[PDB]
Amino acid sequence: RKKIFKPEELRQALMPTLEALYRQDPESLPFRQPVDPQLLGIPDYFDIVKNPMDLSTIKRKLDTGQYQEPWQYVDDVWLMFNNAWLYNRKTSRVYKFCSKLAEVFEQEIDPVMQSLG
Ligand SMILES: CCOc1cc(C(=O)O)cc(-c2c(C)noc2C)c1
Ligand SMILES: CCOc1cc(C(=O)O)cc(-c2c(C)noc2C)c1
C-alpha cells in the first residue's frame, strides 16, 4: 500500500524543479557536468567525495526512469549539494553558488512534493 510512481509521471512532476536549477546563470554552470578533478588540478576530489553527482546525471536518471519514487530524486539533488558544500570553502564562489541552487530548490520542491502525496 505504498504509493506507486510511473516514470513518465515522475518526470512530468519533477522536471520543472530540475529546470529551475539549470536555468540559474551563472550559479548552475559548475554543476551542469561532473566535476573533472584532472581538469581542475585537484586530485584529492574523489578521495573526499566518494559519490559524485551533478545536474546532467540527475537529468539522465529522470529521462531514463531510474527513480522509483520522488525522494530518490531529492537524495541525488542533495548528494550534489552536499558534495559541493563538503569539498569547497564556505567563502568560495562555488559554495555560494551551491547555496543559491539549494535556496531555489527549496522553493520549487515543496509544492511539487505535496502534489505527489
Ligand atoms: C519545464 C521543462 O524543463 C525541461 C524540459 C526538458 C525536456 O526534455 O522537455 C528538458 C530540460 C532540460 C534540463 C533540466 N536540462 O537541459 C534540458 C534541455 C528542461
Ligand atoms: C566547469 C566548471 O566546473 C567547476 C569549476 C570549479 C572551479 O573551481 O572553477 C569547481 C567545481 C566544483 C564543484 C561544482 N564542486 O567541487 C568543485 C571543485 C566545478
Rounded Cα–Cα distance for residues 92 and 49 (Å)? 17
Gyration radius of the chain's alpha carbons: 15
Q: Which domain holds residue 93?
A: 1-117
Here the cell at position 83 is 558534495
CATH label of the domain that carries residue 99 = 1.20.920.10
Distance from CA of residue 71 to its chain's centroid?
12
Q: Distance between CA atoms of 91 and 93, rounded to whole angstroms?
A: 7
Position 90, amino acid: K
Question: How far is the CA of 110 from the CAs of 48, 104, 106, in angstroms?
Answer: 30, 11, 7
Indicate which residue's Cα is closest to atom 7 of ligand 1: 15
Per the entry, the structure determination technique was: X-ray
Write the DSSP assignment of 3-70 as a string of letters: ----HHHHHHHHHHHHHHHHT-TTTTGGGSS---HHHHT-TTHHHH-SS---HHHHHHHHHTT--SSH
CA dihedral for 47, 77, 82, 56, sign (positive or negative): positive
**Ligand 2 atom with least separation from CA of 84:** 15
Count of domains observed in the chain = 1
Burial class of residue 43 (count of CB atoms within 10 Å of its CB; 0-12, 13-18, 19+) = exposed
Residue 107 and residue 17 in contact, taking contact as beta carbons nearer than 8 Å = no
Q: Which atom of ligand 1 is nearest to the CA of 18?
A: 14
Q: Which protein residues touch ligand 2 with a CB less than 6 Å away?
A: 30-31, 35, 40, 42, 84, 87-88, 94
Rounded to whole angstroms, how far apart are CA atoms 63 and 19? 13
Residues 51 and 44: their CA atoms lie apart, in Å, by 13
Q: Structure resolution in Å?
A: 1.8
User: Judging by beta carbons within 10 Å of its beta carbon (0-12, 13-18, 19+), is residue 101 exposed, middle or buried?
Assistant: buried
